[PDB]
Design an enzyme around this catalytic site. Structure first.
Site, PDB file in Angstrom:
ATOM      1  N   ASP A   1      61.709  -5.602 -29.946  1.00 61.08           N
ATOM      2  CA  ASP A   1      60.396  -6.161 -30.197  1.00 61.08           C
ATOM      3  C   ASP A   1      59.962  -6.579 -28.779  1.00 61.08           C
ATOM      4  OD1 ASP A   1      58.141  -7.664 -31.417  1.00 61.08           O
ATOM      5  OD2 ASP A   1      59.314  -9.408 -30.883  1.00 61.08           O
TER       6      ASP A   1
ATOM      7  N   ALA B   1      57.070  -9.457 -28.005  1.00 59.11           N
ATOM      8  CA  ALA B   1      56.824 -10.890 -27.959  1.00 59.11           C
ATOM      9  C   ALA B   1      57.976 -11.711 -28.513  1.00 59.11           C
ATOM     10  CB  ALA B   1      55.523 -11.230 -28.690  1.00 59.11           C
TER      11      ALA B   1
ATOM     12  N   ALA C   1      49.274 -23.578 -36.146  1.00 58.75           N
ATOM     13  CA  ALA C   1      48.764 -22.358 -35.524  1.00 58.75           C
ATOM     14  C   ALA C   1      49.826 -21.274 -35.622  1.00 58.75           C
ATOM     15  CB  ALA C   1      48.424 -22.626 -34.059  1.00 58.75           C
TER      16      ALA C   1
ATOM     17  N   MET D   1      51.837 -17.232 -38.046  1.00 57.66           N
ATOM     18  CA  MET D   1      52.430 -16.293 -37.051  1.00 57.66           C
ATOM     19  C   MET D   1      53.312 -15.153 -37.538  1.00 57.66           C
ATOM     20  SD  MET D   1      52.052 -15.707 -33.657  1.00 57.66           S
ATOM     21  CE  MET D   1      51.743 -13.992 -34.214  1.00 57.66           C
TER      22      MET D   1
ATOM     23  N   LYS E   1      46.384 -10.541 -37.099  1.00 57.32           N
ATOM     24  CA  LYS E   1      45.658 -11.549 -36.321  1.00 57.32           C
ATOM     25  C   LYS E   1      44.349 -11.924 -37.025  1.00 57.32           C
ATOM     26  CE  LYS E   1      48.947 -10.744 -33.357  1.00 57.32           C
ATOM     27  NZ  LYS E   1      50.085 -11.645 -33.033  1.00 57.32           N
TER      28      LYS E   1
ATOM     29  N   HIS F   1      45.245 -13.827 -39.820  1.00 62.74           N
ATOM     30  CA  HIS F   1      45.909 -15.017 -39.276  1.00 62.74           C
ATOM     31  C   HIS F   1      44.855 -16.092 -39.031  1.00 62.74           C
ATOM     32  CE1 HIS F   1      49.189 -16.836 -36.465  1.00 62.74           C
ATOM     33  NE2 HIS F   1      48.318 -17.772 -36.803  1.00 62.74           N
TER      34      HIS F   1
ATOM     35  N   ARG G   1      54.275  -3.630 -39.197  1.00 58.09           N
ATOM     36  CA  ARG G   1      55.390  -4.266 -39.899  1.00 58.09           C
ATOM     37  C   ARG G   1      54.855  -4.862 -41.205  1.00 58.09           C
ATOM     38  NH1 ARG G   1      57.023  -7.038 -34.216  1.00 58.09           N
ATOM     39  NH2 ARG G   1      58.502  -5.411 -33.576  1.00 58.09           N
TER      40      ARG G   1
ATOM     41  N   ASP H   1      62.579 -11.299 -33.075  1.00 59.01           N
ATOM     42  CA  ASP H   1      62.607 -12.748 -32.951  1.00 59.01           C
ATOM     43  C   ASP H   1      61.846 -13.376 -34.114  1.00 59.01           C
ATOM     44  OD1 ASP H   1      60.054 -11.685 -31.999  1.00 59.01           O
ATOM     45  OD2 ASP H   1      59.658 -13.686 -31.212  1.00 59.01           O
TER      46      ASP H   1
HETATM   47 MG    MG Z   1      57.836 -10.819 -32.060  1.00 57.66          MG
END
Ligand code: MG
Ligand code: MG
Lengths: 257, 257
Positions: free
Chosen positions: A8, A10, A41, A45, A49, A52, A156, A182
């Site tokens: 991944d 980020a 916020a 996550m 987006k 989001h 995803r 992550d």
């Molecule tokens: Mg990530």
């Protein structure tokens, strides 16, 4: 047995803690007089987006403060404005976050010596990746391949991106590959794709801490936040969990038995 | 619980006995003064045609024979020239080989009624498939999706074509998909793709008999030949084998346990 690893970006390869997006969300809201916190916020996550943003909009504490400011609840238009703004600002500051997490680089170099192929997937759009990829390549990181939701029918947790990877790296079957992420979504995708799923903790979007607060945090206190996540991972499909990418080649050895 | 079946084309859903390619492969080698057998011609059936030619030249018996006749092993030029001929001859007869195999259609209709997706892969090029799939549609056969080697890094045995079928049909993991084919390459493709593999015997390329020969054959000799193909399919990865498509549904049910 293990011929390729899919990373991944980020909170795994770059952007320690995955703040770039968190930073932005807080601006678009603060600038409108309805300041949100890193918790709420980061709260959503994991989804589009666009959605989001809408999620934050329907968060009662936020929804009320918005109605207080604009004397009216958010409108589908506001969501669409905040979204456009979110991108523009993100493209702006993305490069400041495309630094390969200190641990990673060496690990990638080792895997490559073992003839192991390096691939990746992401939550970031192609536009955004072009930016993060370019900066990360100057900073020393450059996987053999990369795929974004724009490259497939859906992002995803669909295994689409992961199949695209195996297709390009030329690796099969799926269980000859590891998926390293992550976040919860990183785990789902891993499994949905039928591959070995692992989860990084230190610097994850789950652990949500920066390199700063990690290095200067109470051991007992930190050693406790690490479990809330490592456990969080296994509860979603992580065949394994690692505090750092330094434990990668170790999990591989385990798996290959 | 299965959700989709990926069918091969020739010798599986159309062209009983996969005869279209046969005389073309033998003709192209016959013009060079190097006769080959139907067995040799059929060995690499299922693969992308160009590869299939290269595969024939690779064959020791054929290569030696070629070397003996020309005083040098087959060349890329040779392969490329023969391929050009292979395509001319094929294209002028392809329409005559798209008739669905007898009881297949009833099977598909059943599958659909049970809400099962219908995908497919092949060894034919996209240009070839345009002719075949058009004629097939007119004769009542048309899967939900189609994928040729032109759409991915490579043809069989690689599981690339299957992954695209997964992506399009929105199905995961690969284990929720079944692969049905009529050759050795079909078997390898399925296993590599990590899905339930099934080989069909009557009408298959492996059996290599016409409907006539099948109905008018020494039943004892017939069952015996069936046994070699079957043993072959399994030998090469097949999870289960069936004489006709009528048996498929049953096999699915067994798997769902
Ligand atoms: Mg990530
Ligand atoms: Mg075939």
């Amino acid at each position: 047995k293990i011929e390729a690893v899919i990373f991944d970006w980020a909170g795994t390869t770059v952007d320690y803690g995955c703040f770039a997006p968190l930073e932005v969300f807080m601006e678009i809201f603060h600038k409108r007089g309805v300041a949100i916190t890193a918790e709420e916020a980061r709260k959503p996550m994991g989804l589009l987006k666009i959605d989001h943003v809408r999620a934050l909009t329907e968060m009662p504490r936020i929804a009320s403060e918005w109605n207080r400011v604009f004397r009216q609840l958010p409108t589908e238009a506001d969501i669409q404005e905040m979204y456009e703004e979110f991108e523009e600002i993100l493209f702006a500051i993305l490069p400041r976050y495309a630094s390969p997490i200190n641990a990673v680089k060496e690990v990638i170099a080792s895997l490559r010596e073992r003839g192991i192929k390096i691939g990746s997937t992401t939550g970031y759009t192609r536009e955004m990746m072009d930016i993060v990829a370019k900066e990360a390549a100057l900073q020393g990181y450059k996987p053999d391949f990369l795929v974004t939701p724009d490259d497939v029918p859906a992002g995803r947790p669909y295994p689409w991106m992961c199949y695209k990877n195996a297709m390009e790296l030329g690796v099969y079957p799926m269980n000859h590959m590891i998926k390293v992420g992550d976040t919860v979504s990183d785990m789902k995708e891993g499994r949905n794709a039928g591959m070995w799923t692992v989860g990084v903790i230190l610097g994850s979007s789950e652990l949500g801490l920066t390199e700063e607060e990690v290095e200067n945090m109470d051991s007992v206190e930190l050693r406790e936040k690490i479990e809330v996540v490592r456990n969080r991972f296994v509860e979603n499909g992580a065949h394994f969990t690692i505090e750092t990418m330094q434990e990668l080649e170790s999990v591989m050895e385990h798996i290959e038995k």
